[PDB]
């Protein structure tokens, strides 16, 4: 197969999978979904993928989540990166090259700091 997943949330928190090559569908609900994910604001088809030997592709995912790449928003037809921290809503994952090993710890990203406004 051409590429693997690790979960780093919910109750998939350690789960790892091979995926072949074709649309891949994770969700809550078994009837749409390849990738069966348990965890609290997964919608029944959370986020959509594509997969072939060269890469993944995002396609979908859930309305009121965003797709992001270590904390930076992803649009439809994005090419994600191996090892990078893939995050939409609840759900934390990243893939790899099956020659290559996950980290034991979610990818930590650098984001920028907000800023803030005293109420009165």
Not at 60 to 76: I, K, L, Y
Request: net charge negative; with cysteine; charged share 20%.
């Amino acid at each position: 197969m051409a590429w693997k997943i690790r979960f780093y949330s919910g109750l998939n928190q350690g789960a790892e999978v091979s995926l072949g090559e074709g649309r891949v569908a994770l969700g809550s609900d078994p009837l749409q979904a390849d990738l069966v994910l348990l965890d609290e604001g997964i919608a029944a088809v959370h986020l959509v993928l594509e997969v072939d030997a060269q890469g993944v592709r995002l396609l979908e995912w859930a309305e009121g989540c965003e797709p992001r790449q270590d904390g930076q928003a992803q649009v439809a037809g994005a090419i994600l990166q191996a090892l990078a921290g893939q995050t939409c809503g609840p759900l934390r994952w990243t893939f790899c090259d099956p020659q290559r090993s996950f980290p034991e710890r979610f990818p930590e990203a650098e984001v920028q700091t907000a800023p803030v406004r005293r109420k009165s």
